[PDB]
């Protein structure tokens, strides 16, 4: 046959969920596209990884006219 | 318009064969002599009879009689 | 013998056949043949049943077929070991869940429809029943 190949898993997914206290610089989700968009206090890395810029609790919300999922770091 | 990319364009005088003179702006530079204008072209008097449909029976009657 | 003109992929997983059916009511015709059992109808079975019921009604009225065999069923060649990749496609089936109306028919009398559906059902693996169109 010609179907024996496959690639190693990339271990994506949400790494820190909502209402979790995190330190600055910690990865929140590893994604391929921009499935979740960066909100307040969250930056977008080279491979679309959303990372916290300040210490606080993770906040998920749906915003915008396109109903996009935003991740922000609530103040703490 | 841009400064130098365009061709030379200024006023000229065009004189039709029927004496209808027109002053217009063009790129010829020199004056121009027209052989037919819009006011003299036969699209009001010449282009009516141009159909040349022809008749077979009137023509027949013209050639001879009984 | 019905079979898809094109397919996105050649082979398909074995799957399961749980749940109930969707086409419960007689939609187009006046009489239908409903399945009370569970299983898979092959293309050859569908073709044989269609021929039997058409001949039975002497090509009168109209007949609908609410199922279409779209699942490719493979099997390995004769006398080969268990590995060496999946087998080659041999026939096509349509997964049947209880309550699925298989065929419909109108333009003929009731008892003639009874006899035609019985002759058709006699060539099918699953158990069937006769149903009539209902308002609402």
């Amino acid at each position: 046959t010609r179907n024996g190949r496959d690639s190693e898993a990339k271990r994506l997914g949400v790494k820190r969920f909502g209402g979790e206290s995190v330190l600055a610089g910690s990865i929140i989700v590893r994604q391929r596209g921009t499935k979740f968009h960066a909100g307040a206090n969250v930056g977008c890395g080279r491979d679309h990884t959303l990372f916290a810029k300040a210490d606080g609790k993770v906040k998920f919300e749906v915003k915008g006219p396109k109903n996009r999922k935003f991740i922000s770091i609530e103040a703490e | 318009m841009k400064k130098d990319i365009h061709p030379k364009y200024e006023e000229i005088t065009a004189s039709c064969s029927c004496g209808n003179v027109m002053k217009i702006r063009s790129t010829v530079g020199h004056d121009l002599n027209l052989d037919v204008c819009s006011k003299c072209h036969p699209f009001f008097t010449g282009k009516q009879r141009d159909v040349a449909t022809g008749g077979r029976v009137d023509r027949f009657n013209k050639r001879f009689n009984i | 013998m019905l079979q898809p003109k094109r397919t996105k992929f050649r082979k398909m997983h074995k799957g399961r056949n749980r749940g109930l059916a969707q086409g419960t009511d007689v939609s187009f015709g006046s009489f239908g043949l409903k399945a009370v059992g569970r299983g898979r109808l092959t293309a050859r079975q569908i073709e044989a049943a269609r021929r039997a019921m058409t001949r039975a009604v002497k090509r009168q009225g109209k007949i609908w077929i609410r199922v279409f065999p779209d699942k490719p069923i493979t099997e390995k060649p004769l006398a080969v070991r268990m590995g060496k990749g999946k087998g080659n496609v041999e026939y096509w089936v349509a997964l049947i869940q209880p309550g699925k109306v298989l065929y419909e028919m109108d333009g003929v009398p009731e008892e003639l429809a009874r006899e035609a559906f019985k002759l058709a059902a006699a060539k099918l693996p699953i158990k069937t029943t006769f149903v009539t169109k209902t308002v609402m």
Binding site: - | I5, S26, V28, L34, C37, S38 | -
Partner: protein, 177 residues
Amino acid sequence: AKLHDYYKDEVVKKLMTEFNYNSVMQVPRVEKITLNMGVGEAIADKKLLDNAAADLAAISGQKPLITKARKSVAGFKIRQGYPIGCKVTLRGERMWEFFERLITIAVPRIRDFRGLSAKSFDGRGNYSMGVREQIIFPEIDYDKVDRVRGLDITITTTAKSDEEGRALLAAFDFPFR
């Protein structure tokens, strides 16, 4: 300029009374005149595309835009990005001058000219007509041209319907039929 002021008084009065318009701005007006020259043979030779550009610049006093193929097509053996045409957009004063020059000089010199077609108004009042020979424009020199080309004029107006555009063009004594 002549047809411009001619429009501004006579055409506006004529349209207001024959269409019973409530507002002056509702009267149709011509917005642009596009001059296209599709040169398919340019793929084989570049030396005849700058010539087409030159004679189009001569006809209307603007340097033309060398258009390019939007999408690749095999039937005419061209790839995306090849220059295959040249165009000119005329607006305002230049548009009016070219319009008067055309209507009073170019169209009477068309060989066997028996009137234009009134069935080329695209259903939304935008007229488009094609000429068969560029020699009808006195800007070019008949003996010094190398090949007889042809172009197509497009008169784009603000008229919503089809009869409004036809009436607007007729009001300038266009030679329809």
